[PDB]
A and B are shown apart, each in its own frame.
With several copies, the nearest count.
Chain A
Amino acid sequence: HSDMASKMYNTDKKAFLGALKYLPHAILKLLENMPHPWEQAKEVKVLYHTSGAITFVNETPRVIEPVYTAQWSATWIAMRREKRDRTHFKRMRFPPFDDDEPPLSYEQHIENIEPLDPINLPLDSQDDEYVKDWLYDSRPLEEDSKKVNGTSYKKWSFDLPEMSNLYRLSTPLRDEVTDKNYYYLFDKKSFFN
C-alpha cells in the first residue's frame, strides 16, 4: 500500500480515511507499550485492518509493582553512574531524521542489525541472587507457575527473600516515610481544608 495508484485501491483509500478517527487510540496503544530502558526489543500483539489502513497494538503493559519499582531503581542508579563517569554525554539531535527522509523499512534496515545493549545495572551474584536471573525480563516470571498465575500475568506471589531483594534494590525510588505523623497538616484533608 505504498503507492495506491491502481483503481483497485479505491475502497482501501476510503478505509484509510475511516481509520483516521481511531488513530489517537492506536497512538495511545503504541505509546503505552513502549519498551523500557532495560529492554532491547519488545514483541507486541497487534490487530491490523486487512487493507493495511491501521495497526493497533493489542495488549496491556501489566507489571508487578515492586518488580517494576526495582527495575526503574536499577535503571536510575545506572543512569546516574553513566552521567557521572561519561566525560562527554552527546545528546542526540531532534528530529532524528530529515523532513525529506522517508521512514525506514523495518525488514530491510532494522530487522537484521544486532541490537545494542540495554540499560542493565550489574547485579551481584549473592546480594541479588533471588532477582538476578529475571529482573530484566520483559515480563518477569511470566512462565513460572509458582510465582505468577500464568501468562495472562494478573497475579503474583513472592517469597520473603525475593521481596527483601526488591525492597533493597528500590531504595532510591521507594517510599521511606514510615511514620504517619509525618503528614500532620500535610495530607489530603488538610489540603481540602
Chain B
Amino acid sequence: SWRDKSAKVQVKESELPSSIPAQTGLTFNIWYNKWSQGFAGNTRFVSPFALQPQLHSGKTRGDNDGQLFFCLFFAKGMCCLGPKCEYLHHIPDEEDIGKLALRTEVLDCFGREKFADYREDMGGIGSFRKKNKTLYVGGIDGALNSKHLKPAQIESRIRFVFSRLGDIDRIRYVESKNCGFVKFKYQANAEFAKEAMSNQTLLLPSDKEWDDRREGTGLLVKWANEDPDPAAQKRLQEELKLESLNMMVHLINNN
C-alpha cells in the first residue's frame, strides 16, 4: 500500500521545464508570460511527464498535517517535492472522499474553486452546479501519434490508463466520433483523472512510435456534457429518485 512508504520525487527540481513557453512570436510579454507579435495553429503539446500510481504514491507532509487536497503536480507526474510536499500524493479513495465532503461542493479535489458555468470548451475545473462524474476523452488521434488502431483496442487502452485512477462506473468508446466517455464512482476521482490524463499519450512501450511520443499533441480530457441517450437518461432519473429517497430519511431524522 502507498501508506506503507514515503512519496517519491517524480521530477528533480533541476529537471523541471522552464516557465518560459515555446516561442510563438517575436516578443515575450513579461506581464502575461506569453509570446506576442505572431500566430500559431495549435499550441498544445504532449506532456513529458506521467503519473505512475503504484510507483510514485506515498506519504507526504500533507498526511501528517491533515491535508485534505491532493497534489496537482503529483497527478501530472511532475511534483518535485516528493515526501516534503504539502499536498497528498496518492489516488483519491473513499476515506479521503469522506474527509473532502464539506469542501467538495465548491472545490475540486485539488482545492481549486469551481465556477458557476462550464467553460465554453467544457475544460477547466468544472461547475459547482453539477456533480459531474463523467469525462470526455478527445484527441485520441494525436495521443496515438495518428497510429491506425481498431476501436476495441482504443477502448482497451483507455480502460487501462483510466481504471488505475480510481473506481470506474462505466466506459464507452464512440467510434462514430472517435471519442471516449469515462464515468467514475466519485467526482474527486474524475477531477484527479482529468488532470492526470490531460495532454498524455496513449502509446505503450510495445509500439513503434514510442520514441516519437512527444511529437504531436496529447489526449484532450474535458468534462462531459449531458448524455442524450434515452437509455442513459432514464437511469440518470432513477439515480435522482434513489438519491432523493436516501435524503428524505435524513430529513425526517433531523426533523
Contact = CB atoms under 8 A, between A and B. Distances in A.
**Interface size range of chain B in the complex:** under 10
B19 interface: yes
Contacts of B30: 3-5
Interface string A1-40: 0011111000001000000000000000000000000000
B245 interface: no
Interface string A156-187: 00000000000000000000000000000000
A6 to B, nearest CB: 4
B112 to A, nearest CB: 14
Which of A5, A6, A7, A13 has the most CB atoms of chain B within a 10 A radius of its CB? Answer: A5
Contacts of B31: 13
Contacts of A3: 30
Interface of A: 3-7, 13
Nearest to B21: A5
B20 interface: yes
Decide if the interface of chain B is mainly helix, strand, loop or mixed: loop
Contacts, number: 11
Contacts of A6: 19
Interface string B18-33: 1110000000001101
Interface of B: 18-20, 30-31, 33
| Pairs of residues from A and B, 9 with the lowest C-beta to C-beta distance, nearest first | A5-B19, A6-B19, A5-B20, A5-B33, A13-B31, A4-B30, A5-B18, A7-B19, A7-B33
Nearest to A17: B31
B90 to A, nearest CB: 25
Nearest to B30: A4
Given A5-B30, A5-B33, 5 more contacts: A5-B19, A5-B20, A6-B19, A7-B33, A13-B31
B34 to A, nearest CB: 11
Nearest to B18: A5
A5 to B, nearest CB: 4
11 contacts: A3-B30, A4-B30, A5-B18, A5-B19, A5-B20, A5-B30, A5-B33, A6-B19, A7-B19, A7-B33, A13-B31
Nearest to B31: A13
Contacts of A7: 19, 33
B99 to A, nearest CB: 28
Contacts of B18: 5
Nearest to B33: A5
A52 to B, nearest CB: 15
B41 to A, nearest CB: 24
Contacts of A13: 31
Nearest to A8: B19
Contacts of B20: 5
Contacts of B33: 5, 7
B124 to A, nearest CB: 16
